[PDB]
Paper text:
Perforin‐2 (PFN2, [name]) is a key pore‐forming protein in mammalian innate immunity restricting intracellular bacteria proliferation. It forms a membrane‐bound pre‐pore complex that converts to a pore‐forming structure upon acidification; but its mechanism of conformational transition has been debated. PFN2 belongs to the membrane attack complex‐perforin (MACPF) family and shares structural homology with bacterial cholesterol‐dependent cytolysins (CDCs; Gilbert et al, 2013). Distinct from MAC and perforin‐1, PFN2 is a type I transmembrane protein that is expected to be cleaved from its transmembrane anchor during bacterial restriction, releasing from the host membrane an ectodomain consisting of the MACPF and membrane‐binding P2 domain (McCormack & Podack, 2015).
Author numbering:
A (entry chain F): 217 to 266
B (entry chain G): 67 to 116
The structure:
């Protein structure tokens, strides 16, 4: 009796996250006041199994 | 089948004009091939403007 078992498993994972925050605030002597902010978050995940 | 000749192990009747050699040989061959593939892609984009 003979038995031969060959098993090959492969996994790849790539996760890329980018976060950009830009804020600007100007405050004069209680006459002009402007505050703005922008947030951009992008997360991408890719998995490959064999 | 005048003499009702029987095989030595007693499992079949052979006629007088024949003789059996018990070459009881079994050959089994089982082959199994399994290919599996898994792919998952996840993207999440979040944008905030205040």
């Amino acid at each position: 009796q003979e038995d031969h078992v060959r098993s090959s498993f492969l996994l790849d994972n790539q996760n890329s996250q980018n976060t950009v925050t830009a804020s600007a605030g100007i405050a004069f002597l209680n006459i002009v006041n402007f505050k703005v902010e922008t947030d951009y978050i992008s997360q991408t995940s890719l998995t490959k199994d064999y | 089948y005048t003499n009702c000749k029987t095989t030595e192990d007693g499992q079949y009747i052979i006629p007088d004009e024949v003789y059996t050699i018990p070459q009881k040989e079994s050959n089994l061959e089982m082959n199994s091939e399994v290919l599996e593939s898994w792919m998952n892609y996840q993207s999440t984009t979040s944008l905030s403007i205040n």
